[PDB]
């Protein structure tokens, strides 16, 4: 996907999944040619950090966090993919959207 | 907001002799005003192992 989307209810508990992500390889499964490995490189706020993208799994949690709707809502995420043993290019590849939402309850009795 | 280094839980002399922690600052608009600084946590060592019998 362009635009992977997720959501999540406020006060989701910490080290928890908020969503999955997937890329496929033109090479034969189950090998070296194509063990895909994840990575985040943008985050938007880009500070503190809320979230964490693990390698092997491609799943995306929050960190030691609780997210609230009425401290912050909305979160953007920059991805990649790459494969073999993590040696980089010096060539360009192609990046991934991710978006994250903080859904409203009505946690709030009114005064 | 201070830099106050904690470790978190105990650990074990046996099987960890240093771990390899770097220290980064940064401001809230991203920006970078500080070098890395690598520290070197030492683990040090008490007579925890029992003395057995051959």
Same mark, same amino acid.
């Given at each position: ?28 499964? !189950?090998?070296? !040619?194509?063990?895909? @490995?994840?990575?985040?490189? @943008? ?10 993208? !693990?390698? =092997? ?6 960190? @030691? ?9 909305s ?14 290019? =010096? ?15 009505? =946690?709030?009795?009114?005064? | ?19 390899e922690?770097?220290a ?16 070197? %946590? ?9 003395? %057995?019998?051959?």
């Amino acid at each position: 996907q362009d635009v992977f989307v997720g959501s999540v209810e406020e006060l989701s508990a910490a080290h928890t999944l908020v969503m999955k992500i997937n890329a496929t390889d033109a090479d034969e499964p !189950n090998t070296l !040619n194509s063990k895909i @490995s994840y990575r985040i490189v @943008s985050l938007e706020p880009a500070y503190p950090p809320v979230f964490y993208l !693990n390698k =092997d799994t491609g799943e995306i949690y929050t960190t @030691s966090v609780t997210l609230d709707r009425e401290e912050h809502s909305s979160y953007t995420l920059t991805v990649e993919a790459r494969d073999g043993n993590g040696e980089v290019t =010096d060539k360009p590849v192609k990046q991934a959207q991710v978006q994250i939402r903080i859904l409203d309850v009505n =946690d709030n009795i009114p005064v | 907001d201070t830099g106050n280094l904690y470790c978190t839980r105990p650990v074990d002399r046996e099987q960890y002799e240093s771990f390899e922690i770097i220290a980064f600052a940064t401001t809230p608009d991203g920006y970078t005003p500080e070098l890395p600084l690598p520290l070197i %946590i030492k683990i040090e060592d008490e007579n925890d192992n029992y003395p %057995i019998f051959t």
